[PDB]
Design a protein around this ligand. Structure first.
Ligand SMILES: C[C@@](O)(CCOP(=O)(O)O)CC(=O)O
Ligand SMILES: C[C@@](O)(CCOP(=O)(O)O)CC(=O)O
Lengths: 320, 321
C-alpha cells in the first residue's frame, strides 16, 4: 500500500534547544543551530498496509517497547491527518550508533520517520514541511531534516517553527569529537518541561538571538574562535538552567567537567576546539577537522574517557 | 603605642550567596545574602597604633604579610583613620587556626576582626551596624562575620545601607557545616566583577529576595528541608552565573560534583544534609548537628576528599584581652 526508506543523521546543537513554548507541537522557546553528524545514521522503513489495525515498530531488529510505539503511532497519526489516508504502518528502524554510548537517536529517528512515512504514504513534502513534521516527533528532529549546518527558526506557530540549512556540510570542515564517558539520564521531554522551574530560563531564552546571531555569522564566515566561545557559553547556559531547575538536572559527570576545562585550556594553548554538551555527560568537542586527530588524542588521554567518536558534517535526511 | 585592641572573628558559610557588586569599590553587593558563622575557625587580630610608624605593618601567623595583603589592610586602615580623624599607622598582628592549604577563605573573618580591633584600638565604640558597614569595605562577606550566628547582609544601595545583622544567635539552631576539603582558584574580587558578563546574573539577582525570604524563614522556623533545598538551589544559581561568565569561572572540581550528587542522594534517602559551594571546589555540607557525625563519615569516605572540617554556628566578632 506504500513503502519508503529514509536515513537521517543526529545533530549536535551549537545553540541549544531547551524549553518549549508549546510542548504538544514542540514549538521551542528559542531557536537553535546544529550540525548533522555524517557517520551516525538512523534508517527507517515505513510500510503502510491495507487493513493493519494498529501500527507496529521494530527498533534495531527488536520489538519496540510500548512507549516508543505509541510515540511513533501518534507521529504517524499526524502523517495520516496531513494525508487524509487511514492506513496503519509497520515501521522498521535501525541505527549504527555505538552501543551504550548515549548518543541520542530521537532527532535522527523522527527526521528519518518524517521522510519515510510521508514518502511511503505518497506525499512529496518540501524540506521545510518535512522539518515541521519531524519537529512534532522530537523538536531537534526538525534540524536533522536539512543538511549540514542547520538553524531551527523557532516561531510561534506550527507553520513558523522549522529548520533550514545555514550552510551545507562542505562549507566548513568541522569535526565533532564525541568523548563517550565509560560511566554514564532524565529524558529531554521531562527536562524541557522542567526548564520553566529555573529562575534563569527566561533570561537564557531572551538572550538566545544574541547567541544565534554570533553562531550563524561564525558558520557563514568560518570563524572558529567566535563559534568556539559561543558554543561553550551556550552549552553552559543550557546546563545552568538544567542545574537550577527543580528538581535540578545535573547531566554532567565529573569527567565531563575535566573535559570541558581541558578543551578550553587546549584552545587557549593553540589547539582550536570547543566543547558542547547535550542532555547527558558526553562531551562533543567541535574542531576544524585538521585538528581532529590531535583533539581525539588529547581526549583519549583523559582518564575516564571510554572512547572518542569522530563525526564530520552530515547531509540532509534522504530517501534510499 | 597610641591604642591597641585585639578582636576575634569567624569565617562564615553563605546559605544565600553574595555574588556581584552594585559598587565594587564600596563592596555594595547586587543582592543580599545570609550566612552562618563557623565557630571552630577564628582569626585573631591585634591592632597597635604607633606614633612612630610611617606605614602600617601586617604580620600573619608570625610572618610579614605579602605586599598585596598589606596593601589591602592599609587601605582598610585608611578608612578607619578617616572615620576616626586620626593619622596613626598601625602594627597589625593576626593569627588564625585555619587548616593550611585547605582553601578556606579567611578574608571575612580577617576583615571582621580587623574592623573591630582597629576601631577599638583607635578609640571608637562602633555599633554592630557600623562595624559591619566598615568590615564590608574590607571584604564584602566580612560584614557578615561581625554579627553572630545566622546573619543576613542587607544589600542596600549606599555605603550606609549595606550591612549585616544577626537573624538568629548560634544557639537558635544546631546546624553543622561539614566542610569537605578537596585534596586538589580565581579570586572573588575578579569573579564578582565578571558576574556582569553572565546573561543570567540579572535574573539571579532579581530573584534573590525570594530565596532570602525562604532561608530567613527557614532559619527562624528551623525548617531544615526548606533550608536544604534553597541552599543547594542558591549555590547552583551562583555557580550558574560563574560558569556563564566571560571568561567562565568553573570553580567546581570533579570531586565537587561527586559530593554534590552524593549529598542530594543522602538527603533523599533520609540523611538530612545539603550542599553549598563558595568560589572554590570545597563542599560545605550543612546538616542538623545530630546528623553531622554520619555526614562526616560519608564525606570522609569519598575519594578526593582530603579531610572534613566540622564547624558549628559561631558567635559575633568579639573584642578580647
Ligand atoms: C538537549 C538538546 O539535545 C535538545 C533535545 O531535544 P529533543 O527534545 O530531544 O529533540 C539540545 C539540542 O540538541 O538543541
Ligand atoms: C563566593 C562568596 O564566598 C563571596 C565571597 O565574597 P568576598 O570574598 O567577601 O568578596 C559567597 C558568599 O560567601 O556569599
Amino acid at each position: 500500500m506504500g513503502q519508503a526508506t529514509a536515513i537521517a543523521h543526529p545533530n549536535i546543537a551549537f545553540i541549544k534547544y531547551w524549553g518549549n513554548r508549546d510542548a504538544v507541537l514542540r514549538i521551542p522557546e528559542n531557536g537553535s543551530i546544529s550540525m548533522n553528524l555524517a557517520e551516525l545514521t538512523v534508517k527507517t522503513t515505513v510500510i503502510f498496509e491495507k487493513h493493519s489495525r494498529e501500527d507496529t515498530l521494530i527498533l534495531n531488529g527488536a520489538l519496540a517497547d510500548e512507549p516508543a510505539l505509541k510515540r511513533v503511532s501518534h507521529f504517524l497519526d499526524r502523517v495520516r491527518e496531513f494525508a487524509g489516508i487511514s492506513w496503519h504502518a509497520h515501521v522498521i528502524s535501525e541505527n549504527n550508533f555505538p552501543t551504550g554510548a548515549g548518543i541520542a537517536s530521537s532527532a535522527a529517528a523522527f527526521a528519518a520517520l518524517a521522510l519515510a512515512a510521508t514518502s511511503a504514504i505518497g506525499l512529496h513534502l518540501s524540506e521545510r514541511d518535512l522539518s515541521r513534521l519531524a519537529r512534532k516527533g522530537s523538536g531537534s528532529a526538525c534540524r536533522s531534516i536539512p543538511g549540514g549546518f542547520v538553524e531551527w527558526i523557532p516561531g510561534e506557530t506550527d507553520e513558523d517553527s522549522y529548520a533550514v540549512s545555514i550552510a551545507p556540510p562542505e562549507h566548513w570542515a568541522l569535526t565533532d569529537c564525541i568523548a563517550i564517558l565509560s560511566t554514564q539520564p532524565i529524558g529531554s521531554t521531562q527536562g524541557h518541561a522542567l526548564a520553566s522551574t529555573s529562575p534563569l530560563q527566561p533570561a537564557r531564552v531572551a538572550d538566545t538571538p544574541r547567541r544565534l546571531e554570533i553562531v550563524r555569522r561564525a558558520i557563514l564566515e568560518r570563524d572558529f574562535l567566535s563559534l568556539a566561545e559561543m558554543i561553550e557559553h551556550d552549552s553552559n547556559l543550557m546546563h545552568a538552567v538544567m542545574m537550577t531547575s527543580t528538581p535540578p538536572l545535573f547531566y554532567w559527570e565529573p569527567v565531563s567537567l575535566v573535559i570541558m576545562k581541558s578543551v578550553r585550556e587546549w584552545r587557549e594553548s593553540g589547539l582550536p576546539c570547543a566543547y558542547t554538551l547535550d542532555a547527558g555527560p558526553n562531551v562533543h568537542v567541535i574542531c576544524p577537522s585538521e585538528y581532529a586527530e590531535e583533539v581525539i588524542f588529547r581526549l583519549t588521554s583523559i582518564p575516564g574517557v571510554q572512547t572518542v567518536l569522530k563525526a564530520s558534517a552530515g547531509d540532509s535526511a534522504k530517501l534510499i
